[model samples]
Target: LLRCRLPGGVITTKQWQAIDKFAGENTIYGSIRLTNRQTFQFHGILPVHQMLHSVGLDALNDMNRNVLCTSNPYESQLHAEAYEWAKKISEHLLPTYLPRKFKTTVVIPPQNDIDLHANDMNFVAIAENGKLVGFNLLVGGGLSIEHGNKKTYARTASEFGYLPLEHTLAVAEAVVTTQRDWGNRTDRKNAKTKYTLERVGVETFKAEVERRAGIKFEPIRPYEFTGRGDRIGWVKGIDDNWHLTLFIENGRILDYPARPLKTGLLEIAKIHKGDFRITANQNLIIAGVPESEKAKIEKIAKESGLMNAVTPQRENSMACVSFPTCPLAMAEAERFLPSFIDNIDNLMAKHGVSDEHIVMRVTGCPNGCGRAMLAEVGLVGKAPGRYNLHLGGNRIGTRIPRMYKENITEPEILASLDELIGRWAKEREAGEGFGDFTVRAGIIRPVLDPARDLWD
Candidate 1:
């Protein structure tokens, strides 16, 4: 289990090949794992004599020291600028002596790939008349909640108003320093920025940050973001180059009989002069392809079977690595989600709503490693083969779902989901998502059905 950051998820073709080479030569699985945090990991047991663990540690340390950005680089100039500032702040403020790790992100509208509001500090790019202007500063958001702990729950960041472009880096440093000085050091879990904010209040934290930076921020501005998933297919960039987004299910980029994502990407890398960017949603983008090479790249992609399209169900799905890899996992996630997806697809087809787009995510436990709380349909592993079902989160990362059922076997969970899908098909309003419909229809409350017999 090794993890490293890819600042802005940017990786060159050569770097990608190096990663693949390392995996092929060192690991049994011969694959790299993509994380929701726009990072990559090498899972599987390493031989005790092997120096791979040391190598991975060095890699991660280098990445941390060098700094990385949120996954999507093509979002906006504001995004790029903010990423640079983030690096500067990281170098200046994020020291090795910190009590706990701090997470920060810069996000553009339409894709909260960074899960903007869930980070320790979030800089949401603000645009004016289609031009990048400043950012909205959000602070103290986290998702590591204990199961059945009412006092602890996944939370979105609170708005601390706006900062001009020039002041962004300063404010970022101030925020981190403030946290460093005042954050709880006694307890590891409570050392997060969110807990600090809760202890001192957001206003007090903001005041301290402002005092530390010798600056002030503007009032909160109005902003709206509709969705988070990366839009697939080819799109013409502002620079006249073409970029193609390829959906790699559950962020697993590997070769399969019908869907050869890894091999297909390799072929593209051989010819594409452009760089590659990994999306926060666990997708890949072939960026800055020349017009002349677009057709060729597409041809190679199609020929290599990388052009395998995604259904609505597949596109909106995510899962955390579980059994055989993640030691903290009590059940299965990435390995089991595909079969569960098939059941969901069949259920949707039977209800004549197969085309409906729904956000679904699964995690091995209540740790919410997959950010499952933000999904319209969140499945949290409760035991070896049972789960707790949560529903009603929106696509914009604005809401957390309410748990609707608990301690149900996989089939029972599937059956319950099927019933909900059926209800959504018949009762949905114009353009309303299943999540929104569930909330609007007052079905956000948990179900009172007696726990399904796990043996049955």
Candidate 2:
């Protein structure tokens, strides 16, 4: 497995072409995949230099070869500045080595698109007077977990206080070096910075990082984030350019028999002077397009059947790479989620909430590659054709949900959800989302009808 980094998920048309072309030539499936961290990855192995040349991409070697940051360059108020910080921090931490790969993220205010609390190091932009300032420093967060192990549950990061813009990069360097020096190197499972933080306590960890960085800590500042996703549609840029966000199911960039997403995007790239950005939601953004070319691009997208025509329920859905690709997977995810969504659509219609927007995610295992734990509805594979259902996570990164069901087949899952949706429709309060309803109602146990068929 190799990753082609896209800092802030930004890539030029030429670079995108190079990547697609390289995948066609070298990859087994002639396809390129987008990751949750806003990077492009190819499955098969190839020479490093050859890939660097053919892919024409840069790698942030020390920080997991790609810095995960906000990708909504248009609507995100601090996206450009945050991306610059990501680049600088990645460079500053290059010399630092850790027991395992470290991950860093930068997210603008009011958006959890980067899942700020879920990374090894996260910088949530802090602004005053509507201007870019410093960051709210968070450290020691990760998602990888061992199934059936209560000790290995997913955790969110702790706030280590704040840093001004000038000292932020150095502070980041300090944090990385601190983790590099202190993190457990012997046990890979317990080697993440999260464990180190947990073992030493937040104050000691903060002091050590500050000592390493040669900077004094500042008082914590309260920041507000309402938690938003990568909003889909047309957005105007600061320079009066246009950006179009389109869904790319499960981050698989391929041409289906009916919808030619790959080929159509390729054709648009041929004429688009702008760039393409891969979003954290596994979607695409055609950024910086001129007004004159908007119609042409729209025409191409329509012709390829890649228009923004997905239903609200489908728009918020995603899955992880499972089955043949992921060795850790026990069942299907990327290839099966579409049909699962189809069932959801039918369930929604029956429940009279077909137009509702419910964020959903599926992972083939508990590893959380699809960020299932952060979705309103999450499905994790428990065994072959069996899944564990997790519910109540909000759109924001602040909340974690509880497991509601386990080791159920597809039909059982759907039947349970069908009854749940009916209850939600009949009893939910106005403006309450499915997740909020589930949480408030304390519906942590299975609510399926006793008369229904359930696998023992």
Candidate 3:
């Protein structure tokens, strides 16, 4: 395993001290995971990608390397032009490719935190009264599923409209060469451009990318997402300089002999002259700093524990560099969801709801690289300590989860989310949320329409 992409997840504490001294002189769990397409991943038997390609860092292949956005670096100017068009549409789809393996993001709004319409192509940054005008592209979002394959689905990309800012990188090359000429190249499991915009009918793939990007798709305009994670610790931006996100939990930077965290972000990249973003919710920000070095980067993020106060269910946890290094892992996620989320934080303190914040995800396969069907408490695997329980999806990737128990175990998924978190801490309502109170308390079955109520 070797990934290391970093497009809009911009890194540079001098390439984060050369990726923490090449994961302590050649990894084997000297650790540093942080992926979910905001770069860096490594495990045993790796040749350091020619020493991080001489610190210019680039190596993910199977097409599309780290081109996601929205993780707050500049905070305005339409989030720094949607992270400079997500590093100019990943440097213009870096040498382009074909039918499969394509994911992209650039969202900017009331922060969808880059989970906005889960990528295969997305843009969304259109601001009006605050300037920066253009974008709302979204196309065939993907999620990779196969369990009982109702034609393997997960869906989530719509709004094939709007585009400006000089044809947004030529409509990201007419949405990846019209999915490299109508996707489905003899079924790599129904080649995804979300199954070619569900068999070319989102208005004929929006007039076939408006006659190949010569513009002319303009309906969706207004924007709003509300919010979703990151904006964690400190925060200032709009250039008075300051940022601190840091709730690394599932990103696992590593150092453990008394919480070192790769020697506290490699000693904040040796007196950080700023920048080190990485967050698609495998957190880590520490950007820009200045205002007189903000109490010396909060005293080395509070004497090397690298900042604290987690548990909005551990700052909306994440998982997926699945066990024994992802040979399509059948079970165990990023070493078992950090000790099973401390037994889901003692099952959210025996369901009094330990300050509720569940976005929880886990996936060592049901074909997931941990997006866990949009997570409002999920788990996938299905062998070796089993798993399969899913629930109502929310935390803003709008909605999807459902599977509710199948192959069980892990103490029957904490006794079925311990009576569904005791009826969501007793019939939730004011400010409702645990997946819209598990779909208004009926408990599940509100897919509503993911291409005709997807279920399998």
Q: Which candidate wins on lDDT?
A: 3
Comparing 1 with 3 on lDDT, the higher-scoring candidate is 3
Give the CA lDDT, 0 to 100, for residue 437 in model 3.
87
In candidate 3, clashing pairs total: 1
Which regions of candidate 3 fall more than 4 Å away from where they truly are? 1-69, 73-76, 80-121, 124-131, 148-150, 153-196, 205-240, 245-247, 251-278, 284-290, 300-304, 307-330, 337-362, 365-369, 372-382, 385-456
What is the lDDT ranking, best to worst?
3, 2, 1
TM-score, cand. 1 vs. native? 0.89
Say which prediction, candidate 2 or candidate 3, comes out ahead on lDDT.
3
**Scored by Cα lDDT, where does model 3 land?**
0.79
Candidate 1 weakest lDDT stretch, 10 residues: 447-456
Error of 3 at 131 (Å): 5.3
Q: Kindly list the per-residue Cα lDDT of model 2 for residues 128-195, writing each as its tens digit.
A: 76566888888877766667665565567788988888888778878878887888868877788878
Ranking by TM-score, best first?
A: 2, 1, 3
Candidate 3 clashing pairs? Answer: 311-314
Say which candidate scores most in TM-score. Answer: 2
Q: What digit string (tens of lDDT, one per residue) describes model 1 on residues 93-173?
A: 433345566777777765675677557888777777666688888887676666766656667788998988778768977
